Short mmCIF file of all heavy atoms in Angstrom, two decimals:
data_model
loop_
_atom_site.label_atom_id
_atom_site.label_comp_id
_atom_site.label_asym_id
_atom_site.label_seq_id
_atom_site.Cartn_x
_atom_site.Cartn_y
_atom_site.Cartn_z
N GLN A 20 -38.35 -9.46 24.24
CA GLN A 20 -39.64 -8.85 24.79
C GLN A 20 -39.45 -7.38 25.18
O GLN A 20 -40.38 -6.61 24.98
CB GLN A 20 -40.07 -9.70 25.96
CG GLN A 20 -40.07 -11.20 25.75
CD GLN A 20 -40.84 -11.70 24.46
OE1 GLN A 20 -41.75 -11.01 24.08
NE2 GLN A 20 -40.43 -12.77 23.95
N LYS A 21 -38.24 -7.05 25.69
CA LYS A 21 -37.95 -5.68 25.96
C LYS A 21 -37.97 -4.85 24.74
O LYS A 21 -38.32 -3.62 24.67
CB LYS A 21 -36.70 -5.50 26.75
CG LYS A 21 -36.81 -5.60 28.24
CD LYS A 21 -35.68 -6.37 28.90
CE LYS A 21 -34.46 -5.52 29.15
NZ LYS A 21 -33.24 -6.23 29.50
N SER A 22 -37.56 -5.45 23.57
CA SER A 22 -37.57 -4.75 22.28
C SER A 22 -38.99 -4.73 21.79
O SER A 22 -39.37 -3.72 21.07
CB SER A 22 -36.71 -5.52 21.26
OG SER A 22 -36.86 -6.89 21.32
N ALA A 23 -39.75 -5.82 21.95
CA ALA A 23 -41.13 -5.66 21.59
C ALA A 23 -41.94 -4.73 22.48
O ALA A 23 -43.12 -4.32 22.17
CB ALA A 23 -41.89 -7.06 21.73
N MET A 24 -41.24 -4.19 23.58
CA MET A 24 -41.68 -2.94 24.21
C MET A 24 -41.04 -1.75 23.53
O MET A 24 -41.75 -0.68 23.58
CB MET A 24 -41.25 -3.06 25.70
N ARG A 25 -39.91 -1.94 22.99
CA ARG A 25 -39.22 -0.77 22.28
C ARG A 25 -40.11 -0.39 21.05
O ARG A 25 -39.97 0.77 20.54
CB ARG A 25 -37.89 -1.28 21.76
CG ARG A 25 -37.05 -0.20 21.12
CD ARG A 25 -35.55 -0.39 21.55
NE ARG A 25 -35.30 -0.23 22.95
CZ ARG A 25 -35.47 0.97 23.61
NH1 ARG A 25 -35.89 2.03 23.00
NH2 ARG A 25 -35.20 1.02 24.95
N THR A 26 -40.99 -1.25 20.60
CA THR A 26 -42.08 -0.91 19.68
C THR A 26 -43.42 -0.53 20.38
O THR A 26 -44.23 0.03 19.67
CB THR A 26 -42.34 -2.01 18.71
OG1 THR A 26 -43.17 -2.96 19.38
CG2 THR A 26 -41.05 -2.68 18.28
N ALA A 27 -43.47 -0.77 21.72
CA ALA A 27 -44.60 -0.37 22.46
C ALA A 27 -44.46 0.96 23.17
O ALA A 27 -45.43 1.58 23.60
CB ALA A 27 -44.87 -1.44 23.60
N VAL A 28 -43.21 1.47 23.24
CA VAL A 28 -42.96 2.91 23.50
C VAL A 28 -42.74 3.69 22.18
O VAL A 28 -42.73 4.89 22.31
CB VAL A 28 -41.76 3.05 24.49
CG1 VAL A 28 -41.43 4.50 24.72
CG2 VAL A 28 -42.05 2.28 25.76
N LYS A 29 -42.67 3.04 21.06
CA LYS A 29 -42.65 3.72 19.85
C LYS A 29 -44.01 3.98 19.18
O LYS A 29 -44.01 4.54 18.07
CB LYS A 29 -41.77 2.98 18.74
CG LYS A 29 -40.31 3.38 18.65
CD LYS A 29 -40.16 4.92 18.52
CE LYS A 29 -41.01 5.60 17.53
NZ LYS A 29 -40.72 7.02 17.43
N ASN A 30 -45.07 3.59 19.93
CA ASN A 30 -46.39 3.98 19.34
C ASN A 30 -47.19 4.85 20.28
O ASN A 30 -47.60 6.01 19.88
CB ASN A 30 -47.21 2.68 18.97
CG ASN A 30 -47.00 1.68 20.05
OD1 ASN A 30 -46.43 1.91 21.14
ND2 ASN A 30 -47.57 0.47 19.89
N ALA A 31 -47.46 4.40 21.52
CA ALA A 31 -48.44 5.16 22.34
C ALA A 31 -47.80 6.41 23.00
O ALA A 31 -48.15 7.56 22.83
CB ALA A 31 -49.15 4.32 23.33
N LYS A 32 -46.69 6.10 23.86
CA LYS A 32 -46.13 7.18 24.63
C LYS A 32 -45.47 8.20 23.72
O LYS A 32 -45.41 9.42 24.10
CB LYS A 32 -45.11 6.54 25.61
CG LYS A 32 -44.43 7.48 26.50
CD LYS A 32 -45.28 8.50 27.16
CE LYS A 32 -44.60 9.62 27.92
NZ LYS A 32 -43.56 10.32 27.16
N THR A 33 -45.01 7.81 22.54
CA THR A 33 -44.49 8.75 21.49
C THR A 33 -45.59 9.53 20.87
O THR A 33 -45.26 10.57 20.25
CB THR A 33 -43.74 8.00 20.52
OG1 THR A 33 -43.00 8.96 19.65
CG2 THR A 33 -44.55 7.22 19.57
N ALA A 34 -46.86 9.07 20.89
CA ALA A 34 -47.94 9.66 20.15
C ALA A 34 -49.19 9.87 20.92
O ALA A 34 -50.22 10.15 20.36
CB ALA A 34 -48.23 8.81 18.90
N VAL A 35 -49.16 9.78 22.29
CA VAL A 35 -50.18 10.34 23.09
C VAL A 35 -50.10 11.92 23.10
O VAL A 35 -51.02 12.56 23.60
CB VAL A 35 -50.08 9.74 24.52
CG1 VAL A 35 -50.83 10.47 25.56
CG2 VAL A 35 -50.55 8.31 24.40
N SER A 36 -48.96 12.44 22.62
CA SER A 36 -48.89 13.95 22.28
C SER A 36 -49.27 14.16 20.84
O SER A 36 -50.15 14.98 20.55
CB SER A 36 -47.50 14.40 22.60
OG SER A 36 -47.20 15.65 21.96
N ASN A 37 -48.63 13.50 19.87
CA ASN A 37 -48.62 13.82 18.47
C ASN A 37 -50.08 13.76 17.86
O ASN A 37 -50.19 13.97 16.67
CB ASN A 37 -47.75 12.90 17.65
N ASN A 38 -51.10 13.48 18.67
CA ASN A 38 -52.54 13.56 18.33
C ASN A 38 -52.91 12.21 17.59
O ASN A 38 -54.07 12.07 17.33
CB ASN A 38 -52.99 14.65 17.42
N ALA A 39 -52.10 11.27 17.37
CA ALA A 39 -52.39 10.05 16.71
C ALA A 39 -53.44 9.18 17.50
O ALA A 39 -53.80 9.48 18.63
CB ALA A 39 -51.13 9.20 16.48
N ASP A 40 -53.90 8.18 16.89
CA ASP A 40 -54.92 7.31 17.47
C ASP A 40 -54.48 6.51 18.73
O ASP A 40 -55.14 5.70 19.30
CB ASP A 40 -55.45 6.34 16.44
N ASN A 41 -53.20 6.79 19.18
CA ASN A 41 -52.53 5.89 20.10
C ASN A 41 -52.91 6.14 21.54
O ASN A 41 -52.04 6.35 22.44
CB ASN A 41 -50.95 6.02 19.96
N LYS A 42 -54.22 6.15 21.83
CA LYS A 42 -54.72 6.21 23.22
C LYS A 42 -55.94 5.30 23.42
O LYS A 42 -56.59 5.40 24.44
CB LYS A 42 -55.20 7.63 23.52
N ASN A 43 -56.02 4.29 22.51
CA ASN A 43 -57.27 3.41 22.70
C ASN A 43 -56.84 2.16 21.87
O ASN A 43 -56.68 2.09 20.76
CB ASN A 43 -58.51 3.96 22.14
N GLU A 44 -56.64 1.04 22.71
CA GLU A 44 -56.31 -0.31 22.22
C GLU A 44 -54.85 -0.30 21.63
O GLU A 44 -54.23 -1.47 21.47
CB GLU A 44 -57.24 -0.81 21.19
N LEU A 45 -54.29 0.87 21.40
CA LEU A 45 -52.87 1.00 21.13
C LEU A 45 -52.14 1.56 22.27
O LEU A 45 -50.92 1.89 22.15
CB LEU A 45 -52.78 2.04 19.93
N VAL A 46 -52.75 1.72 23.40
CA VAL A 46 -52.26 1.85 24.75
C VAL A 46 -52.54 0.45 25.35
O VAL A 46 -51.70 -0.08 26.15
CB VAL A 46 -52.81 2.97 25.53
N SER A 47 -53.68 -0.11 25.06
CA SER A 47 -54.28 -1.30 25.68
C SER A 47 -53.64 -2.58 25.34
O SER A 47 -54.01 -3.66 25.90
CB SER A 47 -55.76 -1.30 25.63
N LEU A 48 -52.86 -2.67 24.27
CA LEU A 48 -52.16 -3.95 23.94
C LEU A 48 -51.11 -4.17 24.90
O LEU A 48 -50.89 -5.29 25.40
CB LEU A 48 -51.51 -3.82 22.50
N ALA A 49 -50.41 -3.09 25.41
CA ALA A 49 -49.32 -3.29 26.34
C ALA A 49 -49.77 -3.59 27.77
O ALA A 49 -49.01 -3.95 28.57
CB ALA A 49 -48.44 -1.97 26.36
N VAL A 50 -51.15 -3.41 27.99
CA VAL A 50 -51.67 -3.94 29.23
C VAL A 50 -51.30 -5.42 29.48
O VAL A 50 -50.44 -5.83 30.26
CB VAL A 50 -53.28 -3.75 29.27
N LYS A 51 -51.87 -6.34 28.62
CA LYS A 51 -51.43 -7.72 28.65
C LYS A 51 -50.07 -7.99 28.02
O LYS A 51 -49.50 -9.02 28.32
CB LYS A 51 -52.45 -8.57 27.83
N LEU A 52 -49.46 -7.04 27.30
CA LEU A 52 -48.05 -7.18 26.80
C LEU A 52 -46.99 -7.02 27.90
O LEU A 52 -46.14 -7.96 28.18
CB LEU A 52 -47.81 -6.36 25.64
N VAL A 53 -46.96 -5.79 28.49
CA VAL A 53 -46.09 -5.65 29.69
C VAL A 53 -46.54 -6.55 30.80
O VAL A 53 -45.78 -6.79 31.75
CB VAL A 53 -46.09 -4.14 30.04
N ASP A 54 -47.80 -7.02 30.77
CA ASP A 54 -48.16 -8.09 31.72
C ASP A 54 -47.54 -9.52 31.31
O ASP A 54 -47.29 -10.27 32.19
CB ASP A 54 -49.69 -8.26 31.69
N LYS A 55 -47.30 -9.69 30.05
CA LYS A 55 -46.46 -10.83 29.64
C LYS A 55 -45.05 -10.68 30.08
O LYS A 55 -44.29 -11.63 30.19
CB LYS A 55 -46.46 -10.97 28.10
#
């Protein structure tokens, strides 16, 4: 599960800069995921 976070820091936090779509529902999966 920490590795399934290692893919949850490989999408949004890595790309809330790079201009990618990763600020909507691609931040919000980890709401209930890091809640898991």
Side-chain angles (χ1 to χ4, degrees), residues 20-23 25-36 39 49:
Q20 314 305 330
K21 274 142 81 193
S22 46
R25 184 142 301 291
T26 82
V28 175
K29 264 313 311 183
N30 43 7
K32 185 43 191 53
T33 192
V35 165
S36 166

